[PDB]
Design a protein around this ligand. Structure first.
Ligand SMILES: [Ca+2]
Ligand SMILES: [Ca+2]
Length: 294
């Protein structure tokens, strides 16, 4: 329907103050569509769309979530990236903000970090994060976004992985996951599992621990596909006792790109259900709506 009438619907949801109905309208349209609806909306009422959401509803993550959803994806990201560095490194936020991201989104997020804070995002990050652990080095690699093709053959490149894993060539490792193109990763990993006795995800388990462990484990989910990384992040968000911050970072930032998470989630169970469980009566309905499990 006309983006003009869509803006109206929100305005009446924002009048009703109905968090779920706003969230529902959100769920209906991708980030780009929600950008067009945001415009229609400000011309209509001379009110910034996030500014009205903030207005009607007072609260926490639930509020901020609905705002993010009608705000510049890349600014939202650059602020999250600003925040995770503000106090002490928020690794959980790193994952959500660095690894759970397309190369395009990332790019504008870089650019948006300049507009906002007159700084080079990647400089700030390597400043705070350092280069002492593998997870740091991986993260720098990932952020560059230079996917280089791999010298043919899954199996052949799979056996090269598993050897890097055995010897503990954490250099190959970093560079692989830092550069392997996603399309090329799926076959390699299917192959790893078909030949090397241990899934890649177990390989990591053997070699890495703590925040080293999680970074690659996120990596591997993300090269399979964002909806896969998402599903996991959501799950982690569930076990960390309904992590509303994580859930707000990744949803308001990425839902449109990751709607298949509900199916990916099946390996952990029913997404709809677990959120009913882990998240309270305010946040959960909002969440179930966005990720389309009502
Ligand atoms: Ca408020
Ligand atoms: Ca709450």
């Amino acid at each position: 329907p006309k983006v003009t009438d869509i803006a109206n619907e929100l305005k009446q949801a924002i009048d009703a103050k109905d968090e779920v109905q706003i969230a529902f309208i959100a769920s209906e349209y991708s980030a780009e569509s929600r950008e067009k609806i945001a415009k229609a909306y400000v011309a209509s009422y001379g009110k910034e769309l996030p500014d009205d959401i903030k207005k009607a509803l007072k609260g926490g993550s639930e509020e901020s979530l609905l705002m993010d959803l009608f705000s510049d994806r890349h600014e939202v990201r650059a602020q999250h990236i600003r925040d995770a560095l503000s106090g002490r490194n928020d690794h959980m936020a790193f994952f959500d903000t660095v690894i759970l991201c397309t190369p395009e989104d990332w790019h504008e997020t870089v650019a948006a970090y300049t507009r906002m804070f007159k700084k080079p995002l990647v400089e700030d990050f390597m400043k705070d994060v350092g280069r002492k652990e593998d997870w740091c080095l991986l993260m720098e690699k990932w952020m560059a976004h230079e996917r280089v093709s791999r010298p043919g053959s899954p199996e052949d490149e799979a056996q090269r992985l598993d050897q890097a894993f055995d010897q503990k060539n954490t250099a190959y490792l970093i560079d692989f996951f830092g550069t392997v193109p996603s399309a090329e990763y799926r076959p390699i990993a299917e192959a790893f599992k078909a030949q090397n006795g241990k899934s890649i995800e177990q390989a990591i388990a053997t070699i890495y621990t703590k925040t080293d462990y999680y970074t690659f484990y996120c990596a591997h989910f993300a090269l399979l596909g964002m909806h896969r990384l998402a599903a996991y992040l959501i799950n982690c968000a569930c076990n960390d006792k309904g992590d509303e911050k994580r859930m707000r970072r990744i949803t308001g930032m990425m839902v449109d790109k990751c709607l298949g998470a509900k199916h990916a989630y099946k390996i952990y169970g029913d997404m709809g259900t677990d959120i009913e469980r882990c998240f309270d009566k305010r946040m959960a309905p909002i969440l179930r709506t966005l990720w389309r499990v009502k």
